[PDB]
Structures are given as C-alpha cells and as structure tokens.
Amino acid sequence: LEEGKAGSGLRQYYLSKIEELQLIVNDKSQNLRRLQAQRNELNAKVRLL
C-alpha cells in the first residue's frame, strides 16, 4: 500500500497548497469587494446628493 497516505497524501497536501491559492483568490475577492463597497458607497453617496 503506502499510497493513500504517501501518494494521495502528497496529492492532498498539494490540494492544501491549492487551498492557499484559493486563499489568495479568496482574500483578493474579499478586499476587492470591500473596496468595491467603498466605491459603491461613494458613488451611491453622490447619488444621494
């Protein structure tokens, strides 16, 4: 055996690094959507003007 713990184990660790890339895409979506909320709140503010 020694595949699910070693081969699929390093495949799962590579999946964890893929989860790190999805954490970079994740927090990029977070701060980009918060800045999007800032611009939306400012343009909505002059819309209230």
Binding site: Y14, S16, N31
Partner: protein, 488 residues
C-alpha cells in the same frame, strides 16, 4: 560572606518573569492564535519568533546560575499532558507544579537530567492533538539554552541533541509533509538549528552526512515552495561552498533558478553577500559593485555595523581594482574604522601608485589582510597598481612623453610604454586614437558624456528600466493595501 550571601537571591529571578511570560505569551499566543484555523492564518508569528530570537541572541542570562540555580532545566511545558479533555485539574496543576519548587528549596542539577528528554514525546508531546506545532514549539526554544556554551565537552551533548531532534521529528519528518504554519516555520527552525550546530560541524568534522542529506531533504522541500526556507537551507550549502569547495561547473550558472520571492528582509543582504562573495573571485566590475553596495546599504533592522564591516571590506577591496576607491564617507561607526586602520595606508596608496615603496609597505606590516588566505586578490593587486595608474593616465592628458610621464610612471622604455598602454586600450573601458606620425603616440581620449550625443538611445534603457522598477514599486504600493483590506 554577607555581601553575596545577603545580595545573592535578588539577581537570579530577574529574567524569570520575562521568560515565563514570554514563553506563555508566544506559546499560548501562537497555539491559542492559530489553534482554530492554523492553515488560514499564516506568517503572523514568524516575525515574532525571529524577533524573539534576535532579541535573545544577546542574553546575559547564564553568568552565575551554575550553582544551585539550574532548576529551570528539569522543568518543561507540562501543559495539558496525558489527556486532551478535562483539563481543569491540570489548570490547577499549572499553579501546583510551579508552586512546589518554591516552598523551601529544590533538588536541581546541570548535566544529570539531559538525555531523558524523550519521555513525553514517546506517548504525548503536549496534548496528542497539536503534536507537530507543540513538539517543535516546545522543544526547539529551550534546547539552545541548555546547549549554550558550546565548549567544555558539550559537543557530545550537542550530538545527543542532534539525534534527539532528528529521531523525534526530522530524521525525515514526523509526518511526511506537515503543510501548515509549523511546516513553513519548521523550514527556518530546522535551518536555524543547522546554523546553530554548524559550528559543531565545521569545528572538527566536515561535510559527509547532513548537508549532503540536505539535497534529498531540499528537494523532497517540495518544488511548490516559496523557496524562503529552501533558500535559507541553500545559504548554509553556499557558505559550506565558500571556504573551500572551489568547483564552479554546477552551482555557478546552474544553481540559478526561477528565483522566487526570497527576501526574509535579511536574505537579500546576507544571501546577496554570499553570491557576491563567490562572484567576487572573477573580478566582477559591473554587477557585484552595484548589487553588493546595495546589499551593504540593506539590512538596517538589527545591526548595520558589526556585520557590514566584512561586506564593506571586500567591497572596497574590489572597488580599488577599478582605480576609483571610495572610502568611508557617510557611515560613522567605530567598527569599520578599526577594521580599516591597517588597510587605510595601502588603500590610500593605491591611487598614488608607487611600485617599489608600497610593495615593501604591504608585506612590511601586512599581517591580517595578507594572512586572510591565498593572497589572491592582493597578489593580483601588486601588478594591478600599474594598471590603475595607467588608468589614471587615461584620466590624465593625452600625449605621452618618453621621459616626463614615463619616468613618472617608473617605466622608462619606448617598447613597453606603448605595449602596456596598448594592453590598457584592448580592455575597452577607455577610448583612444592610436596614431603614429613621427613616433609619438596620440589619443583622442574623448570622455564626453552623452549630452547632445544620441540621447534617446543613451537614456532610453534608463527610462524603461526606471519605469519598470518604479512601476513594480507601484505594484508594491497596490498589493499591500489589498493585504490591509483583506481582513475587513
């Protein structure tokens, strides 16, 4: 008797509060911080750990604690051991075991309880759940403290610490790839350990086991790494190749890789000092000058005086080769001064360029700069004096006389004058017009700058490169705001 007998117990418990509060704040703060989501929150305690190591590098802790004050050695973590749940009685034991040793006295020793440090890691390191981060965060901080004072037959004890470290986690690892914050931290922890016992390695033995195993452990580090810990592991290999390796067919121009983000806020200075030290043997004039001077101007965080004196020494040593030697002007520290005192007379004697006198001046009082080893660049300098002098002649007037300037250059002969001057012309760093009309050798020596002489092609690459560096600096002012608004 009354002075030290009455004033004896005030000193010892001075670091106790900051060491216990420090290990509880970084231990309970790190484990209690990344305990919920260790994989999500990363690199928050890296700068804290390295700042605590650099903060504890100058500790004067052990000065008199050898006489019945070694009670800090037998104690250890003892945090929630033997059981993961129901830790209330152990919360009481936290005060119990700390209070038992403080009633009347305590049975203590120094070299007795050293080997049986693996009693707990056999069954449960700390809690049987966070074993990796609590095993390395438990063992790795307190081991260099007991392993201090490398001399006095501690080398064997340091070997015991080695086989204990590898045998518990890093024979290969505890689990093949931790792949968490204690993995990315474990890179620089095991690396820092390798620098800790690197003095033991270079002391009497040499490279035939561990740094050779560091290639298999180096590429076992997965290729998907950011190459921070992998590059720090490469630093000890390159330093092992610094003193005497001398093969240049592989690491020189083959070690050069994709070069991922390897900064560490120190690794540019020391790593670039390493690759510039190895790239300083072929007399690099353009690259190592600017990049090694930049590396000199880098790393101001902890100390820019005690360590930069060597990159400064090599820096000026390779700067005087080009004929123009800039001395210490803008830096005021009483370390580079004393380091440069023996070298000052000759580094000032380079520009004047007297062969016979300064040749005796070098070996006259030369002890350390010529006792540094193999006298390579100074034995190149002994005949480079005339090349820097004839380069000063290139910075001088055009017409070359047969008596005035030839007698001035300590070289009075027609053949070797034009022959060696021509050897300075074939270099390509100067500009001359070789013409023979009546026997005199002329030269146009046009050193006019590109002002009103093809300017667009001149500073075109200056505009492109400067806009590239300033524009990646614009990226360096766009991305950190994203790293700011990421959490909110």
């Amino acid at each position: 008797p009354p002075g030290g007998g009455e004033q004896e117990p005030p000193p010892p418990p001075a670091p106790q509060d900051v060491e216990m509060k420090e290990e509880a704040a970084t231990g309970g703060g790190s484990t209690g911080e990344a305990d919920g989501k260790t994989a999500a929150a990363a690199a928050e305690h890296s700068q804290r750990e390295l700042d605590t190591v650099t903060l504890e590098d100058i500790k004067e802790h052990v000065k008199q604690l050898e006489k019945a004050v070694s009670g800090k050695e037998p104690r250890f973590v003892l945090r929630a051991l033997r059981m993961l749940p129901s830790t209330s009685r152990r919360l009481n034991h936290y005060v119990l075991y700390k209070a038992v040793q403080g009633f009347f006295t305590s049975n203590n020793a120094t070299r007795d309880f050293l080997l049986p440090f693996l009693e707990e890691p056999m069954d449960t390191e700390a809690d049987l759940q966070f074993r990796p981060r609590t095993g390395k965060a438990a063992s790795t901080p307190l081991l260099p403290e007991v392993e201090a004072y490398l001399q006095l037959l501690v080398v064997i004890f340091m070997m015991n610490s080695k086989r204990y470290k590898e045998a518990q986690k890093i024979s290969d690892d505890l689990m093949q790839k931790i792949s968490t914050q204690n993995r990315r931290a474990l890179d620089l922890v095991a690396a820092k350990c390798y620098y800790y016992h690197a003095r033991v390695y270079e002391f009497l033995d040499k490279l035939d086991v561990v740094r050779s195993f560091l290639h298999a452990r180096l590429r076992t580090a997965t290729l998907r790494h950011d190459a921070d810990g992998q590059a720090t592991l490469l630093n000890l290999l390159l330093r092992n190749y610094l003193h005497y390796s001398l093969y240049d067919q592989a690491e020189k121009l083959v070690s050069k890789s994709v070069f991922p983000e390897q900064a560490n806020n120190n690794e540019w200075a020391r790593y670039l000092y390493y690759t510039g030290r190895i790239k300083a043997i072929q007399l690099e004039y353009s690259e190592a000058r600017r990049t090694m001077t930049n590396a000199l101007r880098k790393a101001p965080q902890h100390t820019a005086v005690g360590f930069k004196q060597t990159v400064h020494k090599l820096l000026i040593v390779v700067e005087l080769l080009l004929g123009e030697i800039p001395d210490r002007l803008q830096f005021r520290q009483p370390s580079l001064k004393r380091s440069l005192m023996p070298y000052f007379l000759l580094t000032q004697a380079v520009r004047t360029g007297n062969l016979a006198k300064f040749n005796q001046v070098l070996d006259q009082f030369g002890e350390k700069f010529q006792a540094d080893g193999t006298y390579t660049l100074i034995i190149r300098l002994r005949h480079n004096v005339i090349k820097t002098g004839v380069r000063m002649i290139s910075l001088s007037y055009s017409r070359i006389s047969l008596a005035d300037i030839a007698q001035k250059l300590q070289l009075d002969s027609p053949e070797d004058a034009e022959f060696i001057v021509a050897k300075a012309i074939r270099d390509g760093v100067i500009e001359a017009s070789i013409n023979h009309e009546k026997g005199y050798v002329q030269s146009k020596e046009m050193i006019d700058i590109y002002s009103t002489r093809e300017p667009q092609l001149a500073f075109h690459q200056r505009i492109s490169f400067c806009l590239d560096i300033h524009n990646m600096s614009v990226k360096a002012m766009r991305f950190p705001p994203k790293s700011y608004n990421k959490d909110l």
